[PDB]
Amino acid sequence: PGIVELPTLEDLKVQEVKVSSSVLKAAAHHYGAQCDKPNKEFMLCRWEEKDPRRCLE
Amino acid sequence: IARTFYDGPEKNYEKTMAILQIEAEKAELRLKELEVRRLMRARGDGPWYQYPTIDKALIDHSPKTTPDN
Numbered sequence: 001p002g003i004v005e006l007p008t009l010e011d012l013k014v015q016e017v018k019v020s021s022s023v024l025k026a027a028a029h030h031y032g033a034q035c036d037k038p039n040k041e042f043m044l045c046r047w048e049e050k051d052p053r054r055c056l057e
Numbered sequence: 058i059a060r061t062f063y064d065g066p067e068k069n070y071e072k073t074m075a076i077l078q079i080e081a082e083k084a085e086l087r088l089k090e091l092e093v094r095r096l097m098r099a100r101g102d103g104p105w106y107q108y109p110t111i112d113k114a115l116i117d118h119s120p121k122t123t124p125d126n
């Protein structure tokens with residue numbers, strides 16, 4: 001049926017956001033106000049491509 | 058007797074011809090109809106033996122709380 005193509009471990013690396021959920025909840029409203037553009041671009045890619053491998057960047 | 062009660066041979070002759078033509082056409086139509094039924098039931102490409110499938114208009118093409126459908 002074919003080989004499933006997967007990204008390497010190198011290009012799956014990123015600087016993680018290492019704050020707990022309470023910190024995120026406390027910052028969430030301003031975070032959604034300020035970082036709207038990249039988040040919306042990513043989520044549009046996500047619901048259009050229907051593939052996590054196509055929206056890594 | 059012939060003048061009063063009967064007709065000439067032409068009438069019966071040509072009526073027989075018409076009857077034979079109708080009967081032969083019906084026979085060939087019956088054979089063709091059986092063959093057509095067999096082919097349509099085997100392949101399913103005709104108007105007959107068209108068994109229902111799911112209507113595609115029932116599918117919901119809207120975002121689904123999850124990007125991967």
Ligand SMILES: CCCCCCCCCCCCCCCCC[C@@H](O)O[C@H](CO[C@H](O)CCCCCCCCCCCCCCC)COP(=O)(O)OCC[N+](C)(C)C
Nearest residue numbers: 058059060061062063064065066067068069070071072073
């Ligand atoms: C000179 C002495 C000797 C002469 C003997 C002559 C022999 C003949 C006598 C016997 C009678 C024959 C039997 C009747 C069968 C014929 C039925 C049928 O074939 O006739 C139809 C015709 O109908 C006739 O009218 C038949 C009528 C006969 C009815 C018999 C009744 C006799 C009973 C006697 C009763 C007397 C009084 C009773 C007192 C109580 C045909 O239909 P049609 O499609 O149009 O004709 C096609 C031909 N065309 C186109 C040329 C016209």
